[PDB]
From Swiss-Prot, chain A:
GO molecular function: structural constituent of ribosome
Coiled-coil positions: none
Highest taxon in the source lineage: Archaea
An annotated GO BP: translation
Pfam families tied to this protein: Ribosomal_L16
Gene name as annotated: rpl10e
Keywords annotated in UniProt: Ribonucleoprotein, Ribosomal protein
Protein name as catalogued: Large ribosomal subunit protein uL16
Originating organism: Pyrobaculum calidifontis (strain DSM 21063 / JCM 11548 / VA1)
InterPro entries for the chain: Ribosomal_uL16 (IPR047873), Ribosomal_uL16_arc (IPR022981), Ribosomal_uL16_CS_euk_arc (IPR018255), Ribosomal_uL16_dom (IPR016180), Ribosomal_uL16_euk_arch (IPR001197), Ribosomal_uL16_sf (IPR036920)
Swiss-Prot record, chain C:
Keyword line: Ribonucleoprotein, Ribosomal protein
Ribonucleoprotein in keyword set: yes
A single GO BP: ribosomal large subunit biogenesis
GO CC entries: cytosolic large ribosomal subunit
Similarity annotation: Belongs to the eukaryotic ribosomal protein eL14 family.
Record-given protein name: Large ribosomal subunit protein eL14
Lineage of the species this protein comes from: Archaea, Thermoproteota, Thermoprotei, Thermoproteales, Thermoproteaceae
InterPro entries (alphabetical): Rib_uL2_dom2, Ribosomal_eL14, Ribosomal_eL14_arc, Ribosomal_eL14_KOW, Translation_prot_SH3-like_sf
Encoding gene, per UniProt annotation: rpl14e
Gene3D superfamilies according to UniProt: 2.30.30.30
Organism: Pyrobaculum calidifontis (strain DSM 21063 / JCM 11548 / VA1)
HAMAP family on file: Ribosomal_eL14 (MF_00721)
Curated annotation (Swiss-Prot), chain D:
InterPro entries per UniProt: Ribo_uL30_ferredoxin-like_sf (IPR036919), Ribosomal_uL30 (IPR039699), Ribosomal_uL30_arc (IPR005997), Ribosomal_uL30_euk_arc (IPR035808), Ribosomal_uL30_ferredoxin-like (IPR016082)
Gene: rpl30
Keywords: Ribonucleoprotein, Ribosomal protein
Protein name: Large ribosomal subunit protein uL30
NCBIfam families xrefs: PRK06049.1
GO biological process: maturation of LSU-rRNA from tricistronic rRNA transcript (SSU-rRNA, 5.8S rRNA, LSU-rRNA); translation
Record family assignment: Belongs to the universal ribosomal protein uL30 family.
Record-linked Gene3D superfamilies: 1.10.15.30, Ribosomal protein L30, ferredoxin-like fold domain (3.30.1390.20)
Quaternary organization: Part of the 50S ribosomal subunit.
RNA sequence: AGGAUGCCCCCUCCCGAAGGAAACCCCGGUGACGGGGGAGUACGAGGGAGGGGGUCCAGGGUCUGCCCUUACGUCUAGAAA
RNA sequence: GCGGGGGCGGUGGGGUAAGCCUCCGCUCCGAGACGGGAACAACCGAGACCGGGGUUAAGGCCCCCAAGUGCGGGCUUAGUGUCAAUCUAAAAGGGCGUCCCCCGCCCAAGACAGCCGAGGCGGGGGGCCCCGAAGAUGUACAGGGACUAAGCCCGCCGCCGAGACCCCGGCCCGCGGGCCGUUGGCCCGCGUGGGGUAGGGGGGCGCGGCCGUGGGGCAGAAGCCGGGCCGUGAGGUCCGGUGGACCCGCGGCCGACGAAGAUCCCGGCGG
């Protein structure tokens, strides 16, 4: 897997319609809403933390999942799943392409160089704008320090700069 | 005797020679004035005395390491006496190199202007035994002393990069100081 | 190190009224003070002045902060600097 | 029926490298050389044209007194000859100020007569016959502020208000 | 074979495009500076007249000082290459 | 001519990216002088007939280098940095290092740190700087000198500075008009007239001969060496030396008709 800097910049149109894309990769994110998702339970919480993007860019699906585990594991063992709701707000609809000489990947991949340079599907990413909310945490005001620490941990696994915004519901 | 005066940048004499006391002046800022004087008066000669009292602003370690790199890491791999640089260390020759840097390069105008300059450490005895030594200052080139400000004289720089050469000159000052004090 | 004090007599070194004596009557900040001739005496209008644009003389007079031109005028009678303040430098 | 404002437009930027559409409008406004000045009437069609060439010219409301000196100092007739008082009096205009006031006040609609104007006898024409419809100004004394920035940000270009007369005084 | 009815210096006078000060007085700004007057003035490319002095002037060779300056022909989008 | 290219804009579409490939538009280079950019086709200013004077553009005003060691306020201690791009750079992250804005709480003198009697504690953000930050010929590189401002931020004042714009003189051009017995010449008017490769159009100079016309030459023709004058120029013409028999002006016509180059050909002669 190439460095994420190869796929950070938004350089072309979105590539999402999977009826026209051959071999479009499946989304390997198992869960998007962590904690207590039921609306009756979330009325206990009263504070909202948002990990907001600062630059527009593309976040790979593996980077989204990596930030998801480190943040959710920390809130699991420092806050308890019954004391928070954590949602990954974005979905990686954009399909990433790569142009490399490979195995049986179609007949036109055997031609080296920039001839027939349209790449094959190499992953998925989310295209985000500035101010877009990446992670959404509903929580109670006593655990504000822990939720910031978990969100700061998730920020360390993301390719673009992000800032934490804390506001009440 | 020695009469201190302030140099009139507009009333600069055209003929003869002026003497500038460099004590308390900034090296780059005084060199800028000296270079323009020698260019604007093609027949006038300039003498700078007390060249070791010139001042460079900044931390002593920073300035000394700057000079150390010049006299250590700047060299050539061809014939050194034919093609390489020859870096001065003495405060009078250090100041004369700054004025050469501020003069025009590879021209007779630059060559003649530097020949019309003489730089001395302390004050020469034949200058001291004249009837009336008219010295000058350039207040724009003078250094305004402020608390917690960093600078070093050229003499302190010379003692760092050539202590044995400095020691002989300092000893020579003490040897003749009785005679110098008479005048 | 330059000292400007209230009641100190200074000479302007910039502007139209350069070479004219004036009297410090108040301090605005650490950069600006208030000077006055008085006008009828030197021609220095009662404005503020930058400390970089005035040089202090060796004379002084005693007055209150924000002293009036007539108040400045009387204390010039106190030390008799009326002819001194009329002088122009250079 | 409507007396639109009378504006002065001066070309501040040059010919080489100007975009094509801005260049086309400047030609139609007769500003075909640098520092050329034209006097127009601020009709809605006129003001749309000046908006097109906003980043290449400066403009403002011209006063009657400034136009009078502009006519005397830089007015030219066919053959590039200077505009004199005698030529004005031969056509029914007593003074430079009188002809400048009439155009600024709206008493006459154009300053220079058209190509197709037919000179009459006795009747005073509503313009100056055979005056060139452009002025060639001097570069401004004391310089400018910025020829690449707008007047509203401390530059030169754009709508200047009544300060166009001060610039015209510096450009005569 | 060119001018020497020349050329340069000084002086004097006159006209003079675009342009255009200074001292000094007054108004303003902390100030760099702006404005009224001085003043469209002194001056100003060039165009006329005269007086005195000198002797060659134009032109050429070579050198020096200051300013400017990247052999030629060619293909090329692009040549000092 | 049917090889284009530069800058900017369409996240153009593609590509990890490319001084990359392929489209769309304005402008510029090719085929465009000149000022600034340290050099530099296409970045900024600007469009050049010749000479002169003046004023400005971009940009600059400590020296190199014309013009300011210009003005007020603040920040930086790192020589950090040293007025856009080409062009020599810097990220995530850490720092109350330092200057500043804001918010929450305690202190109602019983606040914090160890009775004392004035502020204290914590949070977010902003500016600059430090760490992160490693290279191959020669110095704190990005012009050099050097500078603690001659750096950076908010504002300001004047000046320098092109061939551009203004003015004067001279020249040529396009078009219109007029005059002259005219394969043409001359004069006047007007032109926000005056760059130019390939190419198209219009006029002239030279060389050898021919048809005419007029001349020169042993008191010295052609040729050769140097020089003056005329013409924007191709060129013409004259003077002095050498030479020893041919040659030239004007009108017309015709060509085996113009060289700096072809690893050009022949000869001669060099380092
Ligand atoms: Mg793209
Ligand atoms: Mg050694
Ligand atoms: Mg030697
Ligand atoms: Mg441009
Ligand atoms: Mg003769
Ligand atoms: Mg080739
Ligand atoms: Mg090629
Ligand atoms: Mg070539
Ligand atoms: Mg093609
Ligand atoms: Mg293109
Ligand atoms: Mg080509
Ligand atoms: Mg340049
Ligand atoms: Mg200079
Ligand atoms: Mg540095
Ligand atoms: Mg990066
Ligand atoms: Mg042409
Ligand atoms: Mg013939
Ligand atoms: Mg050829
Ligand atoms: Mg041969
Ligand atoms: Mg040989």
């Amino acid at each position: 897997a190439r460095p994420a800097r190869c796929y950070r910049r938004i350089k072309g149109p979105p590539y999402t319609r999977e009826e026209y894309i051959h071999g479009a990769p499946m989304i390997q994110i198992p869960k998007f809403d962590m904690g207590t998702t039921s609306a009756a339970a979330r009325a206990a919480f009263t504070m909202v933390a948002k990990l907001v993007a600062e630059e527009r860019g593309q976040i790979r699906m593996q980077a989204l999942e990596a930030a998801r585990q480190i943040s959710s594991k920390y809130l699991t063992k420092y806050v308890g799943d019954a004391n928070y709701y954590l949602r990954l707000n974005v979905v990686p609809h954009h399909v990433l392409r790569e142009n490399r000489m490979l195995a049986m990947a179609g007949a036109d991949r055997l031609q080296e160089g920039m001839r027939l340079a349209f790449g094959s599907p190499a992953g998925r990413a989310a295209r985000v704008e500035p101010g877009q909310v990446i992670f959404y945490v509903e929580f109670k005001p006593e655990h504000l320090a822990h939720v910031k620490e978990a969100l700061r941990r998730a920020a360390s696994k993301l390719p673009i700069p992000t800032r934490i915004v804390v506001e009440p519901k | 005797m020695i009469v201190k005066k302030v140099l009139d940048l507009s009333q600069i004499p055209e003929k003869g020679e002026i003497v500038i006391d460099a004590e308390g002046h900034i090296m780059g800022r005084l060199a800028s004035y000296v270079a323009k004087i020698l260019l604007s008066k093609p027949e006038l000669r300039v003498v700078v005395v007390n060249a070791e009292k010139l001042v460079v602003t900044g931390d002593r370690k920073m300035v000394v390491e700057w000079f150390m790199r010049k006299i250590s890491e700047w060299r050539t791999h061809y014939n050194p006496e034919k093609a390489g640089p020859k870096i001065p260390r003495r405060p009078d020759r250090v100041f004369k190199r700054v004025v050469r840097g501020m003069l025009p390069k590879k021209v007779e105008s630059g060559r003649d202007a530097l020949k019309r300059l003489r730089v001395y450490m302390s004050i020469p005895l034949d200058f001291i035994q004249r009837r009336r030594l008219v010295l000058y200052e350039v207040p724009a080139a003078k250094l305004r002393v402020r608390p917690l400000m960093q600078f070093v004289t050229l003499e302190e720089v010379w003692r760092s990069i050539d202590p044995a050469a400095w020691e002989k000159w300092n000893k020579a000052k003490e040897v003749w100081a009785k005679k110098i004090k008479q005048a | 190190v330059k000292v400007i004090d209230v009641g100190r007599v200074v000479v302007k070194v910039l502007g139209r009224e350069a070479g004219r004596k004036a009297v410090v009557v108040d301090i605005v900040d650490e950069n600006y003070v208030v000077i006055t001739g008085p006008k009828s005496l030197s021609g220095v209008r009662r404005r503020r002045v930058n400390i970089n644009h005035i040089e202090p003389t060796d004379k002084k007079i005693e007055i209150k902060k924000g002293a009036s031109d007539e108040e400045v005028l009387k204390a010039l009678e106190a030390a008799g600097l009326v002819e001194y303040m009329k002088e122009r430098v250079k | 029926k409507t007396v639109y404002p009378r504006y002065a437009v001066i070309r501040l930027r040059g010919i080489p490298t100007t975009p094509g559409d801005i260049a086309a409008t400047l030609d139609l406004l007769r500003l075909r050389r640098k520092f050329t000045m034209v006097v127009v009437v601020g009709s809605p069609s006129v003001m749309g044209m000046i908006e097109r060439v906003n980043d290449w010219v400066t403009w403002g409301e011209i006063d009657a007194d400034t136009l009078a000196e502009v006519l005397r100092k830089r007015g030219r007739i066919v053959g590039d000859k200077p505009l004199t008082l005698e030529y004005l009096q031969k056509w029914g205009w007593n003074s430079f100020e009188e002809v400048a006031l009439a155009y600024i006040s709206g008493e006459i609609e154009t300053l220079a007569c058209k190509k197709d104007f037919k000179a009459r006898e006795g009747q005073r024409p509503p313009c100056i016959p055979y005056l060139k419809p452009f002025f060639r100004l001097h570069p401004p004394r004391g310089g400018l502020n910025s020829v690449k920035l707008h007047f509203s940000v401390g530059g030169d270009l754009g709508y200047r208000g009544p300060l166009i007369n001060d610039l015209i005084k510096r450009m005569l």
